[PDB]
Write a protein that binds this DNA or RNA. Sequence first.
RNA 1: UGAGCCUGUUUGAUGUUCUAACGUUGACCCGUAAUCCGGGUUGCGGACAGUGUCUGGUGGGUAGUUUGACUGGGGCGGUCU
RNA 2: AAUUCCUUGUCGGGUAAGUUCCGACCUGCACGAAUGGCGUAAUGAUGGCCAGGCUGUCUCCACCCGAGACUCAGUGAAAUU
RNA 3: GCUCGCCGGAAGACCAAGGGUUCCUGUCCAACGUUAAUCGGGGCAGGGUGAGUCGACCCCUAAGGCGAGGCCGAAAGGCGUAGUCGAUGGGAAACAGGUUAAUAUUCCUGUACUUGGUGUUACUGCGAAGGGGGGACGGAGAAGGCUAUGUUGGCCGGGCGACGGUUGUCCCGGUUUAAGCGUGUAGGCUGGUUUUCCAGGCAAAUCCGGAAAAUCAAGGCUGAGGCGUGAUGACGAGGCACUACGGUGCUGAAGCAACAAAUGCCCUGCUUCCAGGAAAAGCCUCUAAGCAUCAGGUAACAUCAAAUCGUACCCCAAACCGACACAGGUGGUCAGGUAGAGAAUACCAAGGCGCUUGAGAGAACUCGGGUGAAGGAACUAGGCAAAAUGGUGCCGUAACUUCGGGAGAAGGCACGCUGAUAUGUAGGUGAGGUCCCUCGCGGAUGGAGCUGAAAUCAGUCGAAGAUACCAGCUGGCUGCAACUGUUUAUUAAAAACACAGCACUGUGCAAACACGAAAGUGGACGUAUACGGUGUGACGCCUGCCCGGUGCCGGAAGGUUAAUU
RNA 4: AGGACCGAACCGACUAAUGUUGAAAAAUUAGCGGAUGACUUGUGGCUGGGGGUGAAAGGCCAAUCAAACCGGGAGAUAGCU
Lengths: 271, 46
Amino acid sequence: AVVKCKPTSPGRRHVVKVVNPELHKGKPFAPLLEKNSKSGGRNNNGRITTRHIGGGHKQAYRIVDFKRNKDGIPAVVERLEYDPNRSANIALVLYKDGERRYILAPKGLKAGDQIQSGVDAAIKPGNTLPMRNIPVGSTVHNVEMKPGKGGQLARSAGTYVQIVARDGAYVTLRLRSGEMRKVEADCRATLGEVGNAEHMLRVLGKAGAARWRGVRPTVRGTAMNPVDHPHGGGEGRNFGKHPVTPWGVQTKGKKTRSNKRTDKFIVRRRS
Amino acid sequence: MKRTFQPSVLKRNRSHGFRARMATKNGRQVLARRRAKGRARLTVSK
RNA sequence: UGAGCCUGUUUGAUGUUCUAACGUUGACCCGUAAUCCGGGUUGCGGACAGUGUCUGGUGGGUAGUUUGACUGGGGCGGUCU
RNA sequence: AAUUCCUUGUCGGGUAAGUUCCGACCUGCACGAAUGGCGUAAUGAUGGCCAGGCUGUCUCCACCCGAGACUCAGUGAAAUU
RNA sequence: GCUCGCCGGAAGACCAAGGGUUCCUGUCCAACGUUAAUCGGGGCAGGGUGAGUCGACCCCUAAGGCGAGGCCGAAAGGCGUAGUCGAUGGGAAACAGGUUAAUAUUCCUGUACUUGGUGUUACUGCGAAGGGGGGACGGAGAAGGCUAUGUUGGCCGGGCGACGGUUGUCCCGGUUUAAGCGUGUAGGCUGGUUUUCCAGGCAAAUCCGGAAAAUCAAGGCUGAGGCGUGAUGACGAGGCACUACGGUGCUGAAGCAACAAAUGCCCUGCUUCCAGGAAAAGCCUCUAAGCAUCAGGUAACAUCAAAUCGUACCCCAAACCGACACAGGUGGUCAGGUAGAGAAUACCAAGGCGCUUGAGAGAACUCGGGUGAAGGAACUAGGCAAAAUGGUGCCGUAACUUCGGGAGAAGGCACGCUGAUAUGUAGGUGAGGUCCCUCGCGGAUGGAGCUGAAAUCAGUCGAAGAUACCAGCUGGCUGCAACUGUUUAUUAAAAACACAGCACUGUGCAAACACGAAAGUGGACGUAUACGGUGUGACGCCUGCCCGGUGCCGGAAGGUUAAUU
RNA sequence: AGGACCGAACCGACUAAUGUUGAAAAAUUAGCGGAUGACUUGUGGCUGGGGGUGAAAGGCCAAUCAAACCGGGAGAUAGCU
């Protein structure tokens, strides 16, 4: 549910927050945790390589399951949990042999729900099947790109992929960006679409909110001197030139894809 | 008013010490130069 | 299918198929007490991608430099045989 | 007008008297719509103007309390020429 | 030696870093000390630092470093696997009194505790480079129980006052005791035990995880404080004699109760919020290979061992960083009385200091201050500087507004001391006694004793009762930027930068992009509700016409053009 | 509850006077902003000069920055004093 903040302060006048009174209030499952330390955008040479990164809150990593290769054993959902490393909640699942795991939460997954994986499973949200055994004209998420590798497509909140046609040993998919792609039919996908679809309705409201997430300020190129940026200099406010990146390439229209090895799998491009 | 020199023995020895000089190739040239000149004190080791 | 040449001759181009060079930041086994590395088995691409020599285009991202004299001070104007 | 050269433009209010301030006129030397246009409660060691109280800022200065300056014994520089 | 003045959340006491003999004793006054010097952190000689429990060394790791083979590179070299280093973090154990010119949890007295080796007895399934538990973790808030600590009574010792009074409801001093051992309280968390079965934990399991039955409902863990013992001991005002003025030997009275109360402890607890809050070892358990007469394991006795290095002195400072015996800088701990909300301010306690040139005089002028007749901004570029308001409780308060604000708007009234309501009230704490019990640090009642605001009524003094220190000036109209924030260390703090919100464009994951002659690394252990670049800058109403020029995106029939042949 | 309010320790630097061979090669006195957060502080580690970092002032990189310091080419060149 979305809630506005009362204007008790100028830093709260414009805050909109999302609250879900169903997530766990407690500690995460311990045997599925690891350490994770911050970088600052620097590489092994010590140099800044990506800008506007630094600070934030301390976080821990949860081992999420992206393969779903345990076939024939039903699993039952236990609880939904909050994850700081992504924009989608997670779910804890208990198996019939006494093993627990973490999975992504589709929309409408609540405690007491069954889930299963393999070639002999039912067609309903949360189940995992090879893509050769799903009707054409279906919505899925967490689609593999090579057999046995894992999921890489439609992993954000409120996203999905659509199956359009099937031929040979390939299937044609429509993606969120607006592109049509070919993939092998022996790949896997999960039925439904990802949850937390209101994730995008929130307003941070102040600068400290963005500071808490590890984002540092951005400095405009027209506010510098001509030795720091190709946009700098001028008595007053002067531009008189075409926009470019800090290293001299033209923004606002130019194209920057060059990969001839993967051009046979794009049927049509985004518009 | 604060000033420039603030001492610390660990930092001094980790920066300009004998084993630090021996570590690389140019420090050994520093040592060779100072030996050729004939210095009484070779490093900051104390 | 264009030139030679009597349905045979070699090279030219275009399109489809194949595996054996080459790629794999897909799965399993060993060195091994190891998410580097190498060897093996199996899939997926495949003469494409990529690298060396030569060659046309773009290139203030970077570098080296030039931007004249007379003159009731210099500049603007005018002049230089 | 943070923009108007001619300019202290012209009319009104405020003062005994107002090149600054507030409201209008349009004759915009040379405003104008994301190098945004027009408004706007709250906030500002931000620019401009007017009032009450308060006073040595001032008409116009007088007295007093401490530290130097001045005399005595000890130590004892400097720029420049 | 007597008197005077200053600090006292420090100008007192103590750790770490940094320094290195500056520490104690005897001697000297040439140079050093901004003056003299018998004095000194100055010269010369000797003396002084005692550890199984304090630190370091040691065991374990974070960021990071190095790195056998290996992958790259004209050489020099770069990156990294297995490993090995690296604290600001985790891991055993001691208290009180006495003593020196200089050391004290180290030396002496009294009473304790922890970990290893060897031998003898009694019982006995042991064993890791492996499986599991534990260590193990955020911000704010609230009130319940305690202690360190202070005040007053009771008790003990002394006193009867330099000038009116002082045998009393009077004056001064003391009334201290630890670690260890035993008891499980205020309070927090959690159902116990037996049986059968199983696609899980890289192989096994009596361990952890899952499933199904019978049975009893009260077991298990953590836990400040208090009470007993340690303690017939030690300490304690005063007394008994010689003084080298530094002590020795003996002796030693009282040593209880009530109230008030922490920022310290129970509390790593409890309640809520999103921005979701380290790793390894020490420790407890399960088994494999292997051993079974043995070896190893559990407990009680006896005995041996705990090595090496630091330990003096300075720390808002004359001994550290500033060339100085320099009005500057420097992390952590301790927290008495009266008034006060207070760690602010004023006066004091414990303790420590008067700042290393003096004596006179009382001109102009400069520096820091107090008062001022009548006027009250007339000064000046400008109310720059100075003058002024200032507390608590109760009345009362406008335009405008994003409905929270404006607001402490503005403007008012009361405020000392004594007596009564009540020989000390409303409230807090709480003994003796009477009952009960599953018997103890138990429950109900009962009110002795102690402590104690605010209000009303009547009197009284001064010119003045928030009397000292302390402690907002108020209002009206306009430009700019929405707001809290940031910036030219050393002449510019702003209308300049950033910001939440908006739009355009690139990127299908071996992603675009950036650091690298390369291997590689960040973006990210992320996947279009995600990531990079560019411009505008809360919110409300909006954002018109032009594709000729320069850029970017798409097209394919024509014309022009490189190497090669 | 709050990038909420008043105000000490703590972090800063808006106004005036003194000082300018200073007590000080950036300070003293009286006033002034923030003060539960985009806060402040101790110990270690990383980024190297046409390079780094930069809420962006040509700011900082050991009292030195429109290209640090040290040693070399080196007795660079100087139609000028």
